[model samples]
Target: LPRCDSPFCSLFRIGLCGDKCTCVPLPIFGLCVPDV
Candidate 1:
């Protein structure tokens, strides 16, 4: 994974950050808080 200092967190969807990122629901780039 390439080291990115910017907020280019799409590094997530692209699967770059590994454990460095998580898909959270915040009306952001985004998530699904399903009822379990």
Candidate 2:
């Protein structure tokens, strides 16, 4: 799993932050959420 800073994790878990730095939900990056 990717190691995100505590604050980053919180924002991400709350859905307030976007996906990781690499993945996009545009269909092509279906594996976007893999690392996290």
Candidate 3:
């Protein structure tokens, strides 16, 4: 898994909490979260 600050996460696929998770954008950054 990659952190929101990671280039892979911040730039690719938007980001992910887990292999099957997604991420949401914060006011100033991003947060990986469950898709459901």
Worst 10 residues of 3 by lDDT: 2-11
**Per-residue accuracy of model 3 over 1-36 as CA lDDT, tens digit each:** 433343334334463444566566564346665544
**How well is each residue in 1-36 modelled by candidate 2, as lDDT tens digits?**
564222322322434234543333333222223345
Regions of candidate 3 where Cα sits further than 4 Å from its true position = 1-19
Q: Compared with the true structure, what per-residue lDDT tens digits does model 1 show for residues 1-36?
A: 433333433423634234444444244344322222
Task: By TM-score, rank the candidates, best first.
Answer: 3, 1, 2
Number of the top-ranking candidate, with TM-score as the measure: 3
Per-candidate Cα lDDT values, in order, are 0.37, 0.34, 0.48
Better of 2 and 3 by lDDT: 3
Error of 2 at 13 (Å): 14
TM-score comparison, 1 vs 3, better candidate: 3
**What lDDT is reached at residue 12 by model 3?**
43
Candidate 2 residue runs with Cα over 4 Å from true position: 6-17, 20-36
